[PDB]
Amino acid sequence: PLGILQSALSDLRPLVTDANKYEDVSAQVAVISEKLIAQLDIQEQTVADLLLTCFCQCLIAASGTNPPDRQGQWPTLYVKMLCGHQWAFAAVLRRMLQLLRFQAPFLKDSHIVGLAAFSIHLHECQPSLQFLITGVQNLEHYWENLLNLLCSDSVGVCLKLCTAAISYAFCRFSELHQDIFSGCVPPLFLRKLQYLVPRLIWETRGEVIRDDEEADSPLNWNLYALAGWKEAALSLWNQNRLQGLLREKSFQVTFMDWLLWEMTLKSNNDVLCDTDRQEYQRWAVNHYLSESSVVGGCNGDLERGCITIAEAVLQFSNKSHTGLGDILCRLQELICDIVTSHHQKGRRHFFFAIFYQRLELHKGKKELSNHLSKQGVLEMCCRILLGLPPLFLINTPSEKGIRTLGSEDFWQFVNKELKNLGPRGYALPYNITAHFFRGVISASVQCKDSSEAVNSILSATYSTCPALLISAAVGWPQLDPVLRSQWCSLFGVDLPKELRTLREQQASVDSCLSQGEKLSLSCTPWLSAAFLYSTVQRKKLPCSRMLEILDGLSSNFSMVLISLLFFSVMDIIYMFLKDGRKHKDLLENCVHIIHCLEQKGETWVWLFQMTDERKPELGLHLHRAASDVFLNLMPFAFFWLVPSLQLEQVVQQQDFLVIALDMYHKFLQLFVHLDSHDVFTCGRQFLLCCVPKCQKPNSAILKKMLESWEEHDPELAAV
Amino acid sequence: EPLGILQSALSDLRPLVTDANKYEDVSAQVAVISEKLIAQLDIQEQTVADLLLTCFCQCLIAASGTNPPDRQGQWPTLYVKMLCGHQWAFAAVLRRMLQLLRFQAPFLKDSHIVGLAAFSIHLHECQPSLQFLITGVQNLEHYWENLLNLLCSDSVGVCLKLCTAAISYAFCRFSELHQDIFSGCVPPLFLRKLQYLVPRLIWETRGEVIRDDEEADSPLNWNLYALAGWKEAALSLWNQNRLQGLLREKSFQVTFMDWLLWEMTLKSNNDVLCDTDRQEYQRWAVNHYLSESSVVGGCNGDLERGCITIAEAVLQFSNRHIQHSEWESRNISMLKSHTGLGDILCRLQELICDIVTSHHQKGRRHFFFAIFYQRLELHKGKKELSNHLSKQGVLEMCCRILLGLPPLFLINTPSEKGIRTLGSEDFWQFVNKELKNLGPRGYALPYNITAHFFRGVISASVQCKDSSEAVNSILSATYSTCPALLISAAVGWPQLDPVLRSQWCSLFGVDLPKELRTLREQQASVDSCLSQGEKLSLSCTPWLSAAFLYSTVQRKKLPCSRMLEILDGLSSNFSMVLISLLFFSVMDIIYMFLKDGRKHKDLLENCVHIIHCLEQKGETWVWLFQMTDERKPELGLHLHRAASDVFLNLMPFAFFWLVPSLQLEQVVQQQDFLVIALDMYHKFLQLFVHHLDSHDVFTCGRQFLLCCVPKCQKPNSAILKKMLESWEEHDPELAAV
């Protein structure tokens, strides 16, 4: 079956020497007549390399008699025959894939030219392949896959190839007006030889000289008797007809496609040393940075440069990576020229804007598919800030003869779209809450005092952006030596008065836990109850040894006992989302509640209310530090822990019923069972014994329906 | 049967060790007989090694459980002796140890590691174990670094689990005596990598120094055999008050340079830390070594010694990484993964931004440049081999560094009395000795080191009061001290203007100064008059206008005939443009020669056209060819001090191509001609020690000498034909003429 196939398919070469006078047809009829009978199986893995190779053979057979200009009426015919079938033309594609992926690094130097000429001739026939494993579209959705995988793994081959699917097309498909010629070759080959050449082959970047002695002449078809691959792709980049062709729009290269090619080329694959791979870029960036905007580029707007780089980085996420690090180093190389200038007119606002607009597209709530992309882009938004620090980009000083050091930005980004980033809820992670401190330490040099500015910053930080101090406290032990060393490195004097009170509080806590000394209180009941909580929770000590050491008689006591209830009902959850069912610390809260009762009341509902109607100050200094992933999930905890109490939760409380309903409304808007929604009866019971506004028996019968509002809104007016 | 008896013996040695049976050791001598009955990547046997090493690695863990090491016996010493007494097996086990540590580092157990660590310590105790027939290593000590400086780069989580069991075994074997001589049991190097790998991997022991003085007994009675992990066995040992008072001596002292030399070599891949976590470690360490004393090796609290010491290492780690490149004709050779380099250079700019941004600058920068004046003196001309020349691999790092910095460091910023004037005197004195780098052009620098400068003076005037009266002062002090920078702008204007303009418009929207503007005018008086022809303006300084014109021509691909017709004919500043236009063409010829050596005729025609265009005025063009400073008018120095020295060593190679292509009589009415001709021939010989051009020179510097200046009438051509003794007679002939 195949022996005769190899014979026939090999009986072609003798024909094509001089007698190529339309007789290469009946042999094609025979090829097709005998081909009728025949995971990369062996039937296909072998026939492919048999059809293809006949090309690499016949081409070289005929390229000795005459060049391709005059001959070349067989190839179109052979390829039209091949494409005439379906179960074979779909094997050559995958075979060439495997043959340029695995063996590509070393196959041959003349089994290549026998692949370009099969690419091109696969273009002038525009065949149909709508059905295939992956490629659903026409070829144009196949060249890009191949070329991209290849230039990501192997570079030298990509150029060895691109510069051979061109030279075969200025010889062939010549002698025709320059208006329709450009439709023969595909665009991407040129759109990529506009990129590779000046990367590998220097001397052609625009530095040295333009040598030209043979510019207007059909270049020699010498690839079969050549001298190297550095004069077949340079005797082409210097031909006028091409160098004047890389100006159309059908194939441009702009400063958002350069990245997505260079930002995915992993070292250990390239062919350039480090201190050349880091000159290519510094040349490129500074060539798409002095280029018009109608073309891909930005005139001189460093701002626009950084903007584009960030917008590209965000569009690649779709850990350890090497290429991305170079881009994130060029960011610094660019920015460090800004902070040392103190624009005061174009300031950090130009940057953060990007995030806000990349973070609105994912507002179309759906089936657990966009939230993921949201946090995935957010983690990258964070990784960046850690990748373009001179470490005080996040600081907005001023100038009126002095420098004030304020930071009016990064306080909104945090309060809005960063606090909902990491675990533990109320806190941030310990990789971004150190940049702010190691930044105020490093920007406190410009001023004249260097010990007062820091105090002003950290005194302002109490009102706005409190979620940073808590993230420090929760992560202080691995943060003290850092600063204690930085300061001594720069100045070498005592510390200020607002970076050591935290140390004093930690030390007091520690020295008081071992024995017990009725801990004091620094008039700040949402700080001094974070230390006290985190130390315990890390050293595994229980409750009894947590609040047994408070000395509250008339000072700030209830607040230090409510902050703990908050921090204790925001970690019942981190132990639910994290592969769990229920955690045993609610006893701590049932004890804190009894301790608040022993005092003069000091109600606890400020937490379980989302609006800002009458929530006292700390009650809205707390929720301004949480994450909207939890606050949308409190009712769960509310109805978990409530049933452990009765006969005092209402009759001596204020605004209970209202809050219970405000919650039970949201307990439904989550989904769209018996072990989760059982407080039906609970809410039904609290009514019969509550602060009777009207509540005679109406709301005891209305819970038998889905209208907690059909009559409640009016049933409150009678209060 | 060298095997059966072997396994029988190394098995009977198994149970006999659970108890320290007195005198039950001669059974070792039996293995001596067996081995004596049996005697690159060797694989001939390559099993005796494992057969003999597993004996230890198994008998140890088999006995341990009955008694701790100290009360174990005198077994391992005798074993190691019966091994080393045959210096062929001792030449193998080493090889298998290293081969299985490196290649299959992760594919190992948690019980064989200690079996190698204890064996290593026992080796160290038997120092008389010294072999010479092991290529690559002379003594024993070398082996330790040989394997560990590969382990600590290919895989870090095995240089810790192997350098902890050693200590946990030594502190259980020799922890009965040796109040002072304890130091000397373990090998030193082990006890250094710990001090570098423990904190890095785990943070709970970074900065804490003193917490208490509670006395301890010993680690948990050799718990490694049934440990619960390593984060607590490496931590129950860092606190042992007997150790922390041990890594203070000199032979266990890590330092700063010795740290950079190890962090650079970490492969980014195969590491264990995410890229956003191995930069906190560095941002901490760099600060932990700046607050120290110099006796330890760390800085004393300053910052200069913290940058000098990071540059002096990059200029010392690349030397062993020449790492050339080639793509066509690929020789299969993997590339070294992304080294920790770069990162270090990012923690070096977070530190320069803290001594230029301050309130007490006193902006001196003599340092950081005298550090480069040394590596270029280690091998000034040649390191006995032309592989890493000055302008090859050291002047490409004095740039990779000098770029990653801000564009302000290159400028001084004095603050004498708060006035804060501007200037530069340590980048000029230095760029006048790094222009020799760019051999491509010769009359220019590269571009990426010409933007920063012009982009710096603009980011420094800010600090001053009038941000547009210093620039006019700098760029006027220039034109007389550092020409080579402008001519690299002229050659690059159309890629540079939309940066300066945008910057000066983004800081504060005020009109430009009178020195970043003159250039736009001198460029627009060109890009137009080349179109359709009008005239040229001929601003004050010639050698800048000429650069503009010549480079613009080259960039637009025009011929070399417009350049000569759009020009004044009655101006006093005409010739001084043509001279420069000749100089640039010469240099272009010379560049074309150092690229597939040839001549590129057309330029030889351009130059003769120029010489004829300036010959009907009575001037003197033969003083470019004076490689001295004797009498060259001031226009010569301001050009030669911009030209590389790779080229002026070739100027003769271009003086005998376009001299004979002139008339034989219009190159003699000049002043002191032959004094350059023969003074250049003298240099045309030193090059040989092209070759076909020796004839044209031997004749052209031989026929002129008859109808030449009134210096000699005879015996000078005869003398020149005598031999290469032009000097022996010229030294006396020049006396008169």
Numbering used by the authors:
A (entry chain B): 632 to 669, 693 to 972, 989 to 1342, 1356 to 1402
B (entry chain A): 631 to 669, 693 to 1342, 1355 to 1402
Copy text verbatim from the article accompanying this structure deposition.
The FA pathway is triggered by stalled DNA replication forks at ICLs, leading to the activation of the FA core ubiquitin ligase complex. However, the FANCA–FANCG–FAAP20 (AG20) subcomplex is essential for monoubiquitination of FANCD2 in vivo. To understand the basis of the FA-associated FANCA mutations, we determined the cryo-electron microscopy (EM) structures of Xenopus laevis FANCA alone at 3.35 Å and 3.46 Å resolution and two distinct FANCA–FANCG complexes at 4.59 and 4.84 Å resolution, respectively.
One of the major classes corresponds to the dimer of the CTD of FANCA. The two structures of FANCA alone show that the FANCA CTD folds into an arc-shaped solenoid structure, which forms a pseudo-symmetric dimer. The side chains of FANCA are well-defined in the 3.35 Å EM density map, and clusters of bulky hydrophobic side chains unambiguously guided the tracing of residues 631–1370 (helix H3A to helix H13B). The FANCA CTD structure consists of a chimera of 14 HEAT repeats and three helical motifs (HMs) with two to four helices. The convex surface forms a wide and shallow groove (44 Å width, 35 Å length, 6 Å depth), through which the extensive dimer interface (6238 Å2) is created. The two FANCA CTDs interact in a head-to-tail manner, in which the arcC subdomain of FANCA’ CTD (green) interacts with the arcN subdomain of FANCA CTD (orange). At the center of the dimer, two parallel H8B helices run along the 2-fold rotation axis. Two Cys pairs (C999-C999 and C1006-C1006) are in close proximity, consistent with the results of the intermolecular crosslinking analysis using hydrogen peroxide and bis-maleimidoethane. The FANCA CTD structure reveals a long path decorated with a cluster of positively charged residues, providing a rationale for how FANCA might interact with DNA.
